[PDB]
Structures are given as structure tokens and as C-alpha cells.
Structure 1
Amino acid sequence: QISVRGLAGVENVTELKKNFNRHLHFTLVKDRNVATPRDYYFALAHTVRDHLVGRWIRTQQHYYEKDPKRIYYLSLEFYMGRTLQNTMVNLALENACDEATYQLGLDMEELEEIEEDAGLGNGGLGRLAACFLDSMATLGLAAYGYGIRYEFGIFNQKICGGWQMEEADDWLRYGNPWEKARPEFTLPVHFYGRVEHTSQGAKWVDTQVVLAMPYDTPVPGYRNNVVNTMRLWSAKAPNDGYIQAVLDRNLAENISRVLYPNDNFFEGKELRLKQEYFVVAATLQDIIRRFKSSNFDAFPDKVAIQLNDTHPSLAIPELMRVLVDLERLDWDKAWEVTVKTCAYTNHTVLPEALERWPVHLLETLLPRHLQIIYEINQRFLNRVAAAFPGDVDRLRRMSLVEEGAVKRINMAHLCIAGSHAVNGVARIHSEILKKTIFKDFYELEPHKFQNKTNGITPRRWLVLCNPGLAEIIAERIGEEYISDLDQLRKLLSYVDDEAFIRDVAKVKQENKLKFAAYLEREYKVHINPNSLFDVQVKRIHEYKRQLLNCLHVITLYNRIKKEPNKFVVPRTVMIGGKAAPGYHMAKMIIKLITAIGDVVNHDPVVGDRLRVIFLENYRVSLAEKVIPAADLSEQISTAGTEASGTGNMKFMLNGALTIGTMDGANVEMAEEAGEENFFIFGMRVEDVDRLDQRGYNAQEYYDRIPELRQIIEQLSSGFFSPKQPDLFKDIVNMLMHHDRFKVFADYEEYVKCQERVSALYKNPREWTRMVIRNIATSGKFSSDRTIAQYAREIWGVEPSRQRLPA
């Protein structure tokens, strides 16, 4: 149909049809009279998966022959989404499969919707891991993603009476055709026990054994015939009254049962620590086994381990344990190897998110690792003492061990000490690390600290989710940009091209019609497709300030009511996201959003000027639908709180304008497109600090802004909760007395800036010209650029766009 989806060759199509019918008959054990649409999806999945296999086997064989340095991306989260369409795109099979399925009388798009998201992540961090895997494969790196195969990913979200309900995401119910179990690579992991010191050295004894069974999922590079591996571990009980013993095996296997959904507040839960050690222990054994199939001085020349936040920080003490206790290297040599091998990416500055494990917990579960951490801490603090003699305060601040109520291990401190490289994930965030929370460590080892601004894969996030936009771009500048996104700059030469302006606006309107229909179908309510689509989709957090958005929405409503017969640019305000299940305020915000919607969407006087929709069950596959449909991207975190963000980049790439704060990668986005092409508002980081020094008094804003005072009175008095007048008292009280994120401080500038958006939207041609200026400068935010920087500046390997043989 469209060229960027590849060729439909006569042989190819005939072949695909033959294989499809073969899998239907032999794999599914069905005839065409009894096949459910799910059967058809599965037949297609196996058929496509068949085209991966030779490439997978040869890629892994190639790495054995060439023995390149290997990259191990260690993460607790991989937010993969659906695999079928992505696999077809990267193998150039999409048009052939569309044709082959069409000829069998099937609509491929319908079959794609049957596939479950692999929702093995919470949000940004998990998705970043998934985008990185795609880029690593595309750049021909010998890279492996290592994580946990959770039986249950992020919960499915239902709204009942405006409230979030959580449902178990039973994603494996119907089987996963993408994965291959490898029971023959099963490895023991040890817990509890105690340490004996002998003549030979320390020995970890009387441990409990849990087994780690790997499942491998293929990761295809973009049309380079490279297929890398994602290895996820599953917990299995070892095989050594009777009934209960059998049933008790469940306890060991609980380790890999369920993704922890608390992306706000670190809770030191034992099961979570078990997960962290489990993935680390199984992975390092695998790494070392592979390393030996070809003396540890060469280890860092053959192995890079990237730590996705502190979640796999125990990689550092575990590697020491294996090198010292099992391989019998002396400490210093062992340590040298560890530091040159390991590198740490920090993904937050919010202090309640930092992992600070109680010592008593580590003492019980991982006694040997605690010993090793104490030894690391001692040697580290000896280096600090030597560098800064007398600075006792510095010693306390930098210690891996935090004193107080309960002793804790600061895992971030452990990571900086045990890594040759520490990076943030946007320039402003990496600066804040060096100025504030890791200033002491920076002063000791300035050379360790880097920036690696985040990116998104243009495969999933353009070609896949927005084929029409991809096509009209390819019509002008060819297809090379898909793996070299900087080529998008060539679109600057089309900013005054009348036909390209027409094409860009047509695609957007088509995406909106498509999504408007999807709303009506799956969640039956009607929306004006000619309205401005104002979307904020991301996890629900106070710092991301969905509440600021709520205030703006109520302002528009109050203005309409006041002057009903006046023109306003009509809007559909769409807000979506999951709240962590124990995060009360986030749950109240969702409820407030739906409460506003109930009022606004049923007011006769508003009509279709204003609509407020809560998008249920925001996940990767919903993002692929709504982001192409968006006009305005809401990136309105308080300055200094969003480490980078990545949604921001998805929208830029897909033809929406951004309203946002100078936070995270927004700063670099505005810099690339020019500030005049970006709706910047609010406090800078410096402003927030100035406010904090003199003290944030929210009352001041309530007193001086009549519009704001009206909103707060409405919330209080039950305007938005008639049957429950005081439902939102927690929200008002927080906004008035305990608002860490200074919602009121940015209110005035946000509303003024939102007016400028409405003003520009009134001018289709100039809106679309501004869009082109955004799309055309979004190249920097390709994860290909990000990974190329990791490769050259941290891992010490060169990327490649050269094909492997087919």
C-alpha cells in the first residue's frame, strides 16, 4: 500500500500464505471453520517468527566467531509493548504480510489488536530499556538485555465511578510466541545462609537455592539482519507433609511473579530485594560463562555491564564476590575489573525514589554481600580522607552506610564508587547531579560524570505508529532517515512548500479521525475531531503536575460559563496514566479528572467547545494510537523534577506542539527547534531555588489571582463532588499548605501561555509550519544517537550500520 512498509513480492506473499496455513493446521491444530481471530493472530505470529530464526542463530554464531566486546543492559524493567508489527517493520515484511493476510480474507490490523502488550515496566525507565534494545540491534552491537520474566506486568487499569481499579495483567494466559524457553541454561541463585571464614577465605554456606530459568526473546535490528537477545529469568523451585512441601514451591517462584508498580516511593520490601539479587546473580553467572568460552585482566575488554538505575546495583558486590571468593583474585585486582566493567545510569533526583536498603535486611538475605559492601565503603572513605583531610562531614555524606534510626545502604553511593562512568539522562539533569546530590563524588572523581540525553526509537515511534507521516516524509527525502533521524533537518527546506504543509496537516487530521472513532468504539462517547487535541499521558505523579492541567481546564470552563456567547478555540483535553496502587494523592487526582469531566462534558452551554476525557489503561499500545493524534503535548513538570522525560520526544516526532517547562530534555528540545517554536512557560530551576530559600506561600497566589481563588472555592464547596461535598479536601489542603511542586507558582504563566497556543491554533497554516520546524529538528532524540554516545564514551565499542548476510 505505502512504500516504507516494504515490497509485496509474488513469491514472498505465496510463501507467507503457505506458512500461515501450515501453522494453523499443525501448530494451532485448527481448520478454517473453527479458527478464532486469535488463532489467526497466532498463525501470523509464528509465520513472522519463522523469518527471525535463521538471522537469530547466525547473529549469535557471528558473535562467537568474531568475539566482540559484549554489552549487558541490566534492568528490572523492559516495557516492550507488542512485538508483531515491530518485527514486520524491522524485517521489511509488513506489506507482504498485509497482502498475504488480505488474500486469506483477513485484516492484519484486527489481528495486531489481539496481541497483548508485554507490560514488564512502569513507564519511562522501562520503555527506555526497550528503545535502547532496538537501537543496539540497529547499530550492530553485541548487546544483551537481561531482566526478569514477570508472570504479571503492570496492572490493567479500570475506572469505576471515576476511581482507578487494578486488575492483574495476566499477559501469558494464551502463551507468548515470541519467547523461547532455555531450561538447559538454568542457574542456581542463593539466599540467606551465613559466612564462614576459612584458611582459603570466606565461604557462603547453608543458603537456600532458587533456580533461574532463562527465556530468550529476539530483538531485530532495522533491516540489518541483526537479531540480538533479550534474556529474562524466571524463578523455579529446586527439585529436592508431602502435599504441603509441593505447594510450598510457590514461595520460591513468587520471586518472578509480579512487577512492583510503585514508581514514586522506594519501599524496602524483601521480595523486591530478592528480585534485584535474582536477576543480578543469574546474569553474572551467564556473563562469566560466556566470557570463559573463548584470567580476568581481559574481562573489561570483553564485558560492559550497564546498570539501569540502582535496581541491579548488587551486580557490583556480586561481581566482587565471584572474583574474590570463587575465582580467588585479590581484592585490588577484583576491584579494578569491577570498576572498568560497570557503569551506572541515574534516572531520578527525587529523594524518596533513591534506594536505601536497611542493613538488617541485607544482613539476613545476603550476608556476604553486606561484608563486601562494608569493605568497599572502608576503602572508598580512605580515598576521600586522603583527598580531603579533616573533612569529616564529607566522610559522613559520602559513606555507603547511612547512620540514623535504622542503618541503610545508599545504593547510589555504591554505584558511583564501583563504576567507571556515572551518567544522567538529559543535560540539565546531569548538571543537577554534579551541582547537588552527587557534588561530593564529582569533586572526588570529576572524570566519571557524563551526560547521555535520552532518545526514542523512530521505528516504533514513527514508522510503526504513524505510517502516513513516515510516508509523506519519505516522499520528499527518502527512507534513510529511519536509521539516521538527523536527516529530518532536510525538511526545513520544505517549511514554505504549500503541498508539504497540506500533507502534514492531512495526516494529522486523519490520525485524529482515526482516534476519535477508536474512542467512540471501545469507550462509547463522542468527540469533535476538529478540536485541538490537548493530551497529557504519563504516570500520575504530583511532580508531573496533572493538577496544573486540571486547574487550566477548570479555568476554560469558568471562562465559557461567564461569557457563554463568546468564541473560544474548542479543545478535547485528554489525560491518561496509571497511579501506583498505594499512592493516595495520585488516586485522588484521577478521581478529580473524572469529576471535572462529569461536570464539563454534560454542561449544555459548553457544548463541544470543551471536552475532558480520561484515557483508561495508558500503556505502550495506547501511546502508539493517541500520540499520532495529538496537537498539543503537555510536559509541565516542576523545573528540576523530570530527569528527562521521553513522551515529550514521541510527540515532537509525531507533529504535536509542546507546552512545557524548562525541565529535563524539554530544554534540549526547545534549543533544537528554537524557543519561538516551543510554548515555554514557568519557573526555571533557578527560580524554584529562589522561592525555596524565602519559602513557598501558596496563600499568596490564592490571595492575588481571583480566577485561582474561584477554582479552589469550587473544589472545597463540592461544585465537582455534589453528593460528597468534601471529597477533594485532601487536594485543596495539599495545594494550600504542603505543595512540594509549587502548582500555584506556575499557574498564571501556564494560562497565558495556553492562550498563545489557542491563538496559533486559530491559524492552521502557521500552526503546521511550526509543526514542521519541530519534526525537522527532532533528530537528536533518536535513541540511535543516544546509544552511539554510550558505545563510544562509556562501553568503548564502535557502532555499525553494515548488514549481516540474509
Structure 2
Amino acid sequence: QISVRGLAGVENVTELKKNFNRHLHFTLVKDRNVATPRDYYFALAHTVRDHLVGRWIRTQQHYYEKDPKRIYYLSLEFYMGRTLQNTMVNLALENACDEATYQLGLDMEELEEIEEDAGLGNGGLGRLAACFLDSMATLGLAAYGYGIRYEFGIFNQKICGGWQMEEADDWLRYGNPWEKARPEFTLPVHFYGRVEHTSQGAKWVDTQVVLAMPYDTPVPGYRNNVVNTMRLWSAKAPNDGYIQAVLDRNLAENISRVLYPNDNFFEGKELRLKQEYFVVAATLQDIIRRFKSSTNFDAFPDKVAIQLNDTHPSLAIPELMRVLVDLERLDWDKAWEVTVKTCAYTNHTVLPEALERWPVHLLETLLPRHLQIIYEINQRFLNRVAAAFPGDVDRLRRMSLVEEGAVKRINMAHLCIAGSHAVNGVARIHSEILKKTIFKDFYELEPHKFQNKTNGITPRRWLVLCNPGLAEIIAERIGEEYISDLDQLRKLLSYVDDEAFIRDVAKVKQENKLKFAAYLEREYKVHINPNSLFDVQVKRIHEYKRQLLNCLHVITLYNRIKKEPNKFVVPRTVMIGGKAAPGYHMAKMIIKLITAIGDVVNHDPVVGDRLRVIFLENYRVSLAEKVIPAADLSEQISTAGTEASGTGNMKFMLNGALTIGTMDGANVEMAEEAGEENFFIFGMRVEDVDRLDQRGYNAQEYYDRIPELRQIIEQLSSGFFSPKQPDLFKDIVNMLMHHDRFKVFADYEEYVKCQERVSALYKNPREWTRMVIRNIATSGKFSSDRTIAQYAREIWGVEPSRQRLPA
């Protein structure tokens, strides 16, 4: 038992054991003779959950009495992962439970592996919402996460013949002990219909009704007895030949059936639009209801803050207007004032294919009233633009919420800026790019709205939970206060020359690597050398993230070995993992290339154990908690200007891995905090990318001037990595040579050289570890507690609190 895991009191261990047996008996209806590991997991889950209830009820009662300003975080994604350990950590029950289960003759670690990940997210954006909920609860904010309870989350990835296969993530199969259905608070949501204009106002009639049933999940703060709520809506058909009618109820309930598996990509499908309005309509009614129970809406903005996680819930703006104008009967101008002061929008990308632009004919049919409100908003907005920039007709066209052309569309990002009092990017460089390019016009009109809120990660899940060993050796030196005040890690700089610490840091990493090396053989049958440098790149598969640049380096290493077999090279285990959106062909081809390279490299006798290429199957939150603590090198190599922020990069930094990356997203602030000498920066900067575009990017130039790059391309083209299918990778080569939007070749040379410098430092264990300490020591700024405290003060207008609520 380690200190950071809490006390294992005799009274509490005894209490846990009896409640464990009570649940196993009364709740699961089983006895020790027929109970399986899953039964034991649930008995424990229910036992831990019981400890939340009291605090949960009291926290909510507390908000009712004090009536603070409420923060509503709207997101279509909440990538929660597992809840058991996180709950134990935040309640300081980990050692007690470890002890209690030990005494019952059970291995708690084994039971934790049985819990299904709540995979209601695709990647960074969804996981950001998860870290945010944790930080908001830890900072005592009266916050509520509002989303959709998808029956099926992100698909489980299977690799067959080196190809990705998708299979339904039936995460609710065995039930979810953490959620509490609240059918009594079911609300109606309207779709279709038409707009009627009567004497006193417009009316939305003849609509199709779908019920929204909420499910509440507790969100415990870190040892402060605060337990907030994440409310997820589930679609239900109202109760009103016969057989078919009953069966068709599924049409309405399909709304919350599945999470769209696209990360950073817009797909204009009606079902997705229905999901977006569904969460918005139900959430706003719930918000107003709670407000009226605290009518004058002038104080609405003083009691409510609505944060739009990207444009997915952008319909909250016209929906809030619809309710205030049509139902509450406020005049337009009053309603608009309230709406703007209530909403804030967070942008997460600048990639054109990721921006939501909904076809007018779709909104017209599905939400006729909202379309009229959007036109009115646009009309009044453009009048302000015209008045500020008289005669600038092109600006009017560029800023319109309505896009003209083959098919009229609504630019949701433009709608969000117009209806929000604050708009923020997620990393300093990203926020600057928004003001310099994409939203330049809007910035010029309302400079005050634009802010930056650099992303962060919660040190609870991303340090204490996944890397107890490191959290422990740190606590031994500076105490435990850093867990909720990550800036304190700075104090570790005074130990950079401490021989004892240096040895402990390196020991923790070696233990993590052995632990992971073992895991890979257990549930996946793969052997790797624990002494090699663990080079890992885990994140969604996308061309801008350039897993292909990583592939080129791997092949370069392989060719150099084959060229001079008896030459010494630092051993490496290159791990690449991540899911590809089902319809993203190039991403699926990249996964195949990776496994293909592995097939060749991993079975070449000459290479031996000097180089290994493994594709980490089914990358998800639970897997991230295992791989990150074991990594030595973190690959953050997106083309400069494409990764808004990145968060995986922060996770690796906090866990002892050195970073090789471009000056993109948060990488810039990370290098800035640790010192550029303690980072492996390479490649073009944003400015260099623009210059290349002005000039015109010609991949052929690099192919002609770099012999090693040419050899690799020819190996791919000739079928060297695909014997039976010689032209299998033709699309990849064609893309790289003629239409590479991300300039893979342009950063190849500098990337390979930088990787050599990494291998050089790895050969010096002591100096590698000292650099690692400099990184961990300066990762404090990337705690989501800092991020949330900034949102609270600069956007929501509320003060974070670290005060503990009574037991």
C-alpha cells in the first residue's frame, strides 16, 4: 500500500467487507460458490457507489440552498473511461478497498479490468469534457455536464489481416452501476412540424414528439466531498397495423442509439442533426426549469452559464431565443441580450472539413422555426457589420451565417460567434490563428469576445490513478498537495541533481515498461524487449496527425540496419495505435501499412530485437492509462497549425516521457514551460508552412534530393511490404507524391535527424532521466484545474473554491 492511496482503517475495511458481501448477496443475488469475477466487480462497484450517494445528495441540496451561478457544459461527447478506480481515488478509498478485497481473497486490480469503458467520445474533444467535469467538481463549481447516453459508444477496433474491423461497443450489456435513471424528469423534444403566424406571436405546430429521459452519473471532486452531476439524455417514444406501430417506436429511439465515430470530420447526416437538437432542447428546458425554481430573465445570465463544446450544440443559441421569444414572450432585443450573455463557444479546430455547415433544406424540414430565427439573427448581425464597415460588401458575404452556392448552408461557427459573449481557442497558437485567419473578420468586429484557454488534463486520472508509482516518489519529496495544485511540481527542479530521485524516477519507468510489456503478451500474445526505447504515437488515425511520417522514420531505421547489420543502434519498440473513422479510407490504409511494416520488420532475423513495430489495437481511455505511463518517447508530429492543442501530449509529459514534436498546438507552450533544450522540436513552423503554400508544395522535389526517402517510396510502390499485393499501397504513394495536404516529405529530413538526437540521449540513462525530471517538474500549467479556473474567472464569472463540504 502506498501513501497517496489513502488509509486502510480497521473500521472502514470491516465496513467495506460487510457491504461487499451484502451487495453480492442482495444485489447480485449470488453466493460465493457461483460468483464470477464480474459478480465481484459489481459487488465492489456498488459498495463504492454507496459512498458517493450521501455526498451527491448533500452537494445538490447545497446548491439549492446557496443558489450559486450554475455552469452547464454542453457536449455531444464525454469520453469517461472507467469509473471504479477514479471514484476510489477521489474518495480516498483505494487502499481500504484494496485491503478489504484482499481479505476477501480477491485481487482488486483484476476486478478493475472487468469494468467496461464508458466510451461516449471519439478522442481529444470528448476526453477534454471528461477532464473538465473532474476539475469542475474538484474546484467546487456548481457544474453540470449535459450530453447523450449513447447505447453504443465508439466502436471496439479489431485488427484482422492487418485491417481494422469495427464491432459494436455494447457497453451497457451487463448494466451500468454508476448511473441513476430519472424517468420522472422526462421532457418532450419536438421535430418537424410547421410555423404558424398568429396575431400574438409565431407557433411551432404539428410536430413529432420524442421524449428525452435523463440518466444521472455522479462526478466526484478530489477529496472535497463535492459530487456534481453528468446528465445524459436517452431517447424514448411517447406511448401513443398495431404490431408495426409498436415496432416503429425504434425510429424515434434511434436518436440516442449510437455515437458518430468521426473525429475532426463533419458528416451532414440528418440523424446527427437530430442528436444535436435533442441534447440542446432537453437540456435548455431542464436549465430553465431549474432556474424558475431558484419571471424575469434579466437575471438569467447571472445564474446561468452555457458552454458550447465546439459547434455541435450550437442550436442552443436559436433554441434559447425560440423559448424566450415564442414561449416566454420577451421582445427580441431583450432575449438576444440574455442569450449572448449566457452562451460561450469553444472552437477546437481550423480544418475546413471539420466545420459544421448544415444544408438549409435540412433545417427547413427538421427545425423550421429555428431556421427562421437563424435568418433573423443573421439579418440583424449583418446590419451591424454593414454599419461598422460601410461599403465592404465582401465582408458581408464572408461573415454571413448563411453560405450561398450550389446548396445553401448555415455556418454553425458563425452562428456561435454571433450569439456568444466569449469565443476561445484551446492553445495559444490556435487562438492566435483563429484571430489571424478563420475568424479574422469577427475578431475585427468584436475583439473583446476572443480569448484563449489552453487545454489541460486532470492529474487525478492521468497521474495518481494510472501512475501510482510516480505519484508516490513525488509525494515522498513534496507532499500530496500537488495533486490538486499541479504547479507545485516545480519544487521537483531542486531534485534534478538528486541521485536518489534520479534513480527512483528511472525505476518507476522501468517498472511501468515491464508491467506493460507483460500485458502485451497476456491479452494480446506479443513479445517485446523491455530494455528498448518505447517510442509511442497513440491518437486517432488522421493524415494531419501524420502517423505516416512516423512510418517513414521506422522504415528508414529498418533500411539503415539492413545496410549495416553489425552496426550498433539504440533498440526501439515503436508503438502506434488509434482508431480510424469507418469511412475514412486513407486512415484505414495507414493502419494496414503499419501492420504491414510490422510483418516485415518483426520477422527479419538480421534486425533481431533491435527494432519492433507494434500496432496497439483498440486504443481507448483504459489503454491510454496503461501505455502512457510506460512510454519513453511521445510522438506529437502534426503539421504545424493543424493540431489545435492536443492533450495526449500533456499526458506523456506528466508521466515521464520525452517529447519529439513540431511547434504545433500545446507543444509550443509545453516546450516553453520546460525549456526548448528539454524538448525535441523539429520541422516547419506555421510560417514555414504558409511560405511553402505560397510557393506551391511539390513533393517530387524532396523525392529527387533525398536518396533514403526515394528508396522508401520505391519499396512501397514495388510491393516490398505487400508481396501478394504489389500495388496494395498505390493510393498512399500517390497521395504522398501528388496531393499531400500535410507536407509529410517536407519534415522528413529534420524529423529523422531529430530522432537521431533522441537515440543519442537515450544512450545516456542519467541525462535522459534528468531531462525527464525537467519535463515532469514543469508540466503543472497543463492541469485542467488551471484551465477550468481560467474559464471560471474569465468567461463564466464565478470563483473556484477548494473548500471541503461536510462529510
TM-score (norm 1): 1.00
Give the superposition deviation at 1:109: 0.1
3-state SS in 2 of match to 1:212? strand
The 3-state SS of whatever aligns with 2:543 is coil
What CA distance in whole angstroms lies between the structure 2 residues aligned with 1:101 and 1:380?
Answer: 62
2: CA distance, partners of 1:274 / 1:253: 11
Q: SS of the counterpart of 2:308?
A: strand
Aligned-partner Cα distance in 1 for 2:406–2:187: 38
Q: Deviations over 1:625-653 (max 9, x none)?
A: 00000000000000000000000000000
The alpha carbon displacement at 1:311 in A equals 0.1
Q: Tell me how far apart the structure 1 counterparts of residues 460 and 527 of structure 2 sit (CA, whole Å).
A: 31
2:632 touches 2:658 (CA, 8 Å); kept in 1? yes
Distance 1:728 1:161 in 2: 15
Q: What do the CA deviations read for 1:15-34 (whole angstroms, capped 9, x no partner)? A: 00000000000000000000
For residues 402 and 493 of structure 1, the distance between their equivalents in structure 2, rounded to whole angstroms, comes to: 57
- The CA deviation string for residues 697-740 of structure 1, in whole angstroms up to 9 with x for no partner, is 00000000000000000000000000000000000000000000
SS of structure 2 residue aligned to 1:523: coil
Tell me the number of residue pairs that the alignment of Structure 1 and Structure 2 aligns. 806
Deviates more, 1:359-368 or 1:517-526: 517-526
Cα distance in 2 for residues equivalent to 1:227 and 1:654: 27
- Tell me the distance in 1 between the aligned counterparts of 2:74 and 2:265: 21
Q: Secondary structure at the match of 1:740?
A: coil
Give the Å deviation of 1:46.
Answer: 0.3
Q: Give the deviation of 1:265 after TM superposition.
A: 2.8
TM-superposed deviation, 1:797: 0.1
Q: Is the 8 A contact 2:425 2:431 kept in 1?
A: yes
Is the 1:220–1:227 contact (alpha carbons within 8 Å) kept by the matching residues of 2?
A: yes
Instruction: Give me the whole-angstrom Cα distance separating, in 2, the residues matched to 1:670 and 1:312.
Output: 33
Secondary structure at the counterpart of residue 770 of structure 1: helix
Q: 1:70–1:143: 8 Å Cα contact kept in structure 2?
A: yes
**Match in the other structure for 1:159:** 159
Tell me if structure 1 keeps the 8 A contact 2:264–2:349. Answer: no
Aligned to 1:482: 483
Q: Distance in 2 between matches of 1:774 and 1:493?
A: 13
CA deviations on 1:585-632 (whole Å, 9 max, x unpaired) are: 000000000000000000000000000000000000000000000000
Measured against aligned partners, the alpha-carbon deviations of 1:643-685 in whole angstroms (never above 9, x if no partner) come to 0000000000000000000000000000000000000000000
Deviation at 1:102, TM superposition (A): 0.2
Check the 8 A contact 1:264/1:580 in 2, yes or no: no
Distance 1:262 1:589 in 2: 16
- CA deviation profile, 1:479-533 (whole Å, cap 9, x unmatched): 0000000000000000000000000000000000000000011111210000000
- CA shift at 1:264, angstroms? 3.9
Distance in 2 separating the partners of 1:724 and 1:268: 35
Deviations 1:564-583 (A, max 9, x none): 00000000000000000000
Note the 1:276-315 alignment, pairs <5 A: 276-294=276-294, 295-315=296-316
Measure, in 2, the Cα distance between the counterparts of 1:166 and 1:57.
Answer: 40
In the alignment, is the contact (CA less than 8 A) between 1:16 and 1:47 conserved in 2?
yes
Tell me by how many angstroms 1:267 deviates: 1.3
Q: Deviations over 1:335-391 (max 9, x none)?
A: 000000000000000000000000000000000000000000000000000000000
Distance 2:265 2:320 in 1: 28
Q: Is the 8 A contact 1:180 1:215 kept in 2?
A: yes
Deviations 1:116-140 (A, max 9, x none): 0000000000000000000000000
Counterpart contact for 1:545–1:638, Cα < 8 Å: yes
Displacement of 1:417 = 0.1
**Identical pairs, percent:** 100
Return the alpha-carbon distance in structure 2 between the equivalents of residues 36 and 515 of structure 1. Answer: 26
Uncovered stretches (5+) of structure 2, i.e. residues with no partner? none
**Tell me, what secondary structure is at the counterpart of 2:800?**
coil
2-structure distance, mates of 1:277, 1:517: 46
Matching residue of 1:240: 240
* Distance in 2 separating the partners of 1:105 and 1:776: 39
Does structure 2 retain, via aligned residues, the 8 Å contact 1:73–1:143?
A: yes
How high is the TM-score relative to the length of structure 2? Answer: 1.00
Q: 2 CA distance for matches of 1:261 and 1:370?
A: 27
Retained in 2: the 8 A contact 1:71–1:306? yes
SS at match of 2:590: helix
CA distance in 1, matches of 2:264, 2:355: 10
> Could you say what secondary structure the match of 2:482 adopts?
helix
Q: Partner of 2:741: helix, strand, or coil? A: coil
Find the residue that maps to 1:450 and give its secondary structure: strand
Q: How far, CA to CA, are the matches of 1:364 and 1:161 in structure 2? A: 44
**What per-residue deviation string (whole Å, max 9, x for no partner) do you get for residues 268-323 of structure 1?**
10000000000000000000000000210000000000000000000000000000
Distance in 2 of aligned mates of 1:336 and 1:589? 49
Q: Alpha-carbon deviation of 1:243?
A: 0.3
Give the distance between the partners of 1:52 and 1:555, measured in 2 at CA: 53
**Does the Cα contact within 8 Å between 2:671 and 2:678 map onto a contact in 1?**
yes
- What secondary structure sits across from 2:85 in the alignment? helix
Q: CA deviation at 1:440?
A: 0.1
Partners of 1:235 and 1:29 in 2: CA distance: 30
Whether the 8 Å CA contact 2:82–2:622 is kept in 1: the answer is: yes
What is the distance in 2 between the residues matched to 1:98 and 1:333?
A: 57
CA contact (8 A) 2:142 2:228 kept: yes
3-state SS of paired residue (1:312): coil
Q: Matched residues in 1 for 2:265 and 2:782: separation?
A: 28
Cα shift at 1:200: 1.1
Query: Can you give the 5+ residue segments of structure 1 that lack an aligned partner in the other structure?
Result: none
| Per-residue deviation, 1:262 | 1.5
Measured in 2, the distance between the counterparts of 1:156 and 1:352 equals: 25
Contact 1:715 1:732 in 2 (8 A): yes
Post-superposition shift, 1:686?
A: 0.1
Match of 2:231, SS?
strand
Is the Cα contact below 8 Å between 1:138 and 1:801 reproduced in 2? yes
Moved over 3 A (4+): none
